[PDB]
Structures are given as C-alpha cells and as structure tokens.
C-alpha cells in the first residue's frame, strides 16, 4: 500500500503552488522572455507551458523540462516541445493526446482563418 504524498498524503510541500498556465500564462510568460518575440505569440508559449529562463528565446517546459532555444520562423510552442519529445506530461494535462496528435500528423496552432479559406 505504498502511496505517499504522490497519491495519499495531503499537501506534500506545505502550501506552495506548482505553477499553472491559466494563472501564469500570457502575463507570466511574457514577463520571463521580455520584449523580443518570434512570429508566434508568447501567450501561445504560455498555453503549452513554456517558462523562459529570465532571457528571451531560451525557455524550458514544465515537467518535460525541454530546453528550446532559437525557434524556427515557422513553428509553435506545442509543435516544438511536443514533436521534439512526444511525452510532455504537463502537455497531456493541457489538451491531452488529442492535441498531441494534432501536431504529430497535421499542422497544429496558427489560426485567424477559421476554415483556412
């Protein structure tokens, strides 16, 4: 019956909160990177769960700790950390395998067209 805080004991740490996009998404992320920003939107990087390291470009994902720097002119937060490592737990929580497949099969992210003309 070995469970432990992992799945038994109450608040392990004591009170601290293990981050969360909904709260620390747009504003938060945008604060980590700064002014700079590629074709995509920082808010997007926040959606996937990418927290910069106090400097623009280089950012590590939560749980999957994927360190990505020097993104591509045509890409997206999810597409990057996902494809690179299709096993980001934090991702499964964001939009589950549903989105995971969205990328590893077709083009994910990038909207504004609704129906893509």
């Amino acid at each position: 019956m070995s469970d432990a805080v992992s799945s038994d004991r109450n608040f392990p740490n004591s009170t601290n909160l293990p981050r969360n996009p909904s709260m620390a998404d747009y504003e938060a992320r945008i604060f980590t990177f700064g002014t700079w920003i590629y074709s995509v939107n920082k808010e997007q990087l926040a959606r996937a769960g990418f927290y910069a390291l106090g400097e623009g470009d280089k950012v590590k994902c939560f749980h999957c700790g994927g360190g990505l720097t020097d993104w591509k002119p045509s890409e997206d937060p999810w597409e990057q950390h996902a494809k690179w490592y299709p096993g980001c737990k934090y991702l499964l929580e964001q939009k589950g395998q549903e989105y995971i497949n969205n990328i590893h099969l077709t083009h994910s992210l990038e909207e504004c067209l609704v129906r893509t003309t």
Partner: peptide, 9 residues
C-alpha cells in the same frame, strides 16, 4: 528550435 544541451561539446 535547436536543442539546448550545451553541457560540454
């Protein structure tokens, strides 16, 4: 995006 890594190469 390129893989950070760095470490020692």
């Amino acid at each position: 995006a390129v893989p950070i890594a760095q470490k020692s190469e």
